[PDB]
Amino acid sequence: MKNYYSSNPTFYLGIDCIIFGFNEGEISLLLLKRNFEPAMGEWSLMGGFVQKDESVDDAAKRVLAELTGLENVYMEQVGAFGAIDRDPGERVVSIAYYALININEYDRELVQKHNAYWVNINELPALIFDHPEMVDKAREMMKQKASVEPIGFNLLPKLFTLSQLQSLYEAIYGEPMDKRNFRKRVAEMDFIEKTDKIDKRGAALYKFNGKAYR
């Protein structure tokens, strides 16, 4: 059995989940009031710790489910945050994970039962520790992702107008966009495709495809 590596120290390994939600033209962040010390009661990302019996990726899934009830949310790793004094309680290196989801009814009731709250990304309260830095990094990742592949397949209807698409991009990027230049930029995205169908007024309908994955 003994002890490979026992000369080295061990560390608490944190998990923080960053859940962006799109609804009615706005992005919100899912937040809670932290249920343990230090900084108990203060505004927080969904925070937990990696356990011995699980991968770090599965820790994220578990932490999310424990603190919000949400299951079946695919998340992408944001990074390992390991500044010495990031957590005032102990040395904690935290691994952040993020997703962008479409905010829907059953999920809404579930989240509310956990005392998690959707807060508009332009009106965030002061978050504990380095959570604002984590959120900023996830938001930049989301921006970059949206420029190279479909940002999600159930954020918008299967067939969507350019106006609907523009509202999603403006929310992600956090600034209004020029309609003509946005249309030109979309024409350069081979993963968005104009169909023959029209909205029912007369606006052209577009769809995401799988061309960014080839």
Place this chain on the structure above:
Amino acid sequence: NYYSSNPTFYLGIDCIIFGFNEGEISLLLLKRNFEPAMGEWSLMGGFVQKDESVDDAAKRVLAELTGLENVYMEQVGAFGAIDRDPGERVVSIAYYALININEYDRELVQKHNAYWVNINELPALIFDHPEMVDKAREMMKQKASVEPIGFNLLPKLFTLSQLQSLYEAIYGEPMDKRNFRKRVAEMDFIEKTDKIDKLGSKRGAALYKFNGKAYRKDPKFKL
């Protein structure tokens, strides 16, 4: 004692140092100096210590195992599969860089028994090191697409062929010369100087430089 209902983990460090030299990319490798898997081909592997940030751990590990200092690395990810390290549960945070080989002390590296291996002729690496390398390589490609790159990998006055060679090595593919120079035209961070190449491979070729102001990374990503 906060958080004591939770366990603690060994936190690995792995450094993935790609080197650019004579139009090709290499990986800096070593023979692992501790067990298990002692003597086998490995990345610069260590562990985070109590004294240091994880970023600073990656610096110390790099300097201990190669002598290289002042090398900026970007985080690849935390690799946390339960069985990735057969010795023990270790969550390893991999870091990467693409450096200019000639710009560093090649004898200092040699002294540390670290070897540049060509990126297309890698030996079998230990544990999940090939996965880490693959991930770093994909990030290098993604950056090269969306950002200005290679200020310290090219001479201050460089040709379009030299710039092309960098991109070709990064993506690992020959490129169309026609379309590349068209893409180079849309890059506002590369400016054409008055000067010309009197020593290199295409004599009299236009020498370009990076415009520092335009090279600078945007604080927020632009569509």
